[PDB]
């Protein structure tokens, strides 16, 4: 029949596929995952940008039916879309662990996730062990981290520390990880990252009935409501276990409790493309959560 070129950008690499015009999101997705040797596909997605937002390729829908720009090469970022509740228990494959590691580290360095200065040092030291292996003063000498991006910018300008001082601090912890295998290092990294308050949280601007501005956090645990001045600690949390159903129409969401006699939870958001995101992530995370509670296998969402 007929293919169009698709560019797939991963945390690691850029590659191209010839995508059939008839293909659905699942076809292209499965082709990418197979190419990467990835079986734990339920965590991942193909993300593009439209206008103000990002969007995720829908599995059921033809790739070209998407509001994605058709100018070739049509570009997607292959990324984690759903985060595990506990990375150490759920990330079975090396490739999965590695892809979360790179992505999460990038979220730390990009300051997508708040991270205190002392923690950012601990993380760096695990990233270093992951890349260089065991420390050896014979080999890793003064300035061996010079051309490395290790700490968030925010940490760097919080202090009158020099690069050499920071490198000294990082190396000191680096030396303590001796004998830690590289995949062990990356998982230790993920274990400390996952305890950060912003980790794995999808934030959205929303309003209540009155119209006050609030932030919605959608994560693996549930739906959380924040004062917009504070993304770290929510004022309220509706965990997925208390949730029966999520519905939407006309810029308003309705969250339904298990007890049909209890009043529903509603919020509103006027950005339509953003709403698609909210809806996808709510249903997806809610599903994965319920599968965990039932000790069922996880499954590819969308």
């Amino acid at each position: 029949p007929k293919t169009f070129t698709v560019r797939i950008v991963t945390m690691d690499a850029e590659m191209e596929f010839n995508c059939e015009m008839k293909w659905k999101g699942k076809d292209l997705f499965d082709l990418v995952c197979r190419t990467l040797g990835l079986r734990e596909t339920w965590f991942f997605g193909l993300q593009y940008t439209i206008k103000d937002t990002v969007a995720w390729l829908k599995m059921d829908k033809k790739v070209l039916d998407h509001d994605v720009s058709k100018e070739e090469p049509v570009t997607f970022h292959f990324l984690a879309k759903f985060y595990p509740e506990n990375a150490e228990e759920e990330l079975v494959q090396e490739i999965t662990q590695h892809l979360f590691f790179l992505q999460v580290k990038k979220q730390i360095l990009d300051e997508k996730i708040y991270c205190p200065p002392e923690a950012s040092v601990l993380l760096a030291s695990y990233a270093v062990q992951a890349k260089y292996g065991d420390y050896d003063p014979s080999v890793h000498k003064r300035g061996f981290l010079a051309q490395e991006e290790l700490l968030p910018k925010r940490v760097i300008n919080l202090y009158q520390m020099t690069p050499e001082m920071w490198e000294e601090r990082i190396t000191a912890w680096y030396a303590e990880h001796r004998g830690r295998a590289r995949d062990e290092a990356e998982m230790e990294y993920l274990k400390i990252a996952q305890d950060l308050e912003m980790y794995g949280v999808n934030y959205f601007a929303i309003r209540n009935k009155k119209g006050t501005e609030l932030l919605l956090g959608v994560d693996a645990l549930g739906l959380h409501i924040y004062d917009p001045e504070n993304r770290l600690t929510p004022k309220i949390s509706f965990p997925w276990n208390e949730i029966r159903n999520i519905s939407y129409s006309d810029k308003e969401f309705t969250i339904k409790p298990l007890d049909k006699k209890i009043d529903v939870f509603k919020f509103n958001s006027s950005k339509l493309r953003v709403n698609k995101l909210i809806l996808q992530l709510c249903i997806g995370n809610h599903d994965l959560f319920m599968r965990r509670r039932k000790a069922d296998s996880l499954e590819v969402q969308q």
Binding site: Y114, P116, P117, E118, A119, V121, L122, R154, N157, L158, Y159, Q160, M161, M165, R169, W173, I192, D195, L196, E197, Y199, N208, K209, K210, T212, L214, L221, G222, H224, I225, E229, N230, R231, L232, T233, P234, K235, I236, S237, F238, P239, E242, P257, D259, I262, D263, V264, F265, F267
Partner: protein
């Protein structure tokens, strides 16, 4: 027999967790204090200041509040 054996395996794992974890929290605290004097307080972010106030611990405390009152609270915000 094997069950007492498993319990002991479980206790071993637990001990190691708590031991590695305590050490880590202690080193994080030491480091934070060791570099405090080099901190440029004028550059402190609200997140930083809001941080000086675990994620799972805080969740369980919010999770306990009844659905009805959270909803009522939400609409009053």
């Amino acid at each position: 027999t094997d069950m007492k054996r498993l319990d002991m395996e479980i206790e071993k794992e637990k001990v190691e967790y708590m031991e590695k974890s305590k050490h880590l929290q202690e080193q994080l605290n030491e480091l934070k204090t060791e570099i405090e004097a080099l901190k440029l307080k004028e550059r402190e972010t609200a997140l930083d200041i809001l941080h000086n106030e675990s994620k799972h611990n805080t969740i369980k405390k919010l999770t306990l509040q009844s659905w009805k009152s959270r909803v009522a609270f939400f609409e009053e915000l």
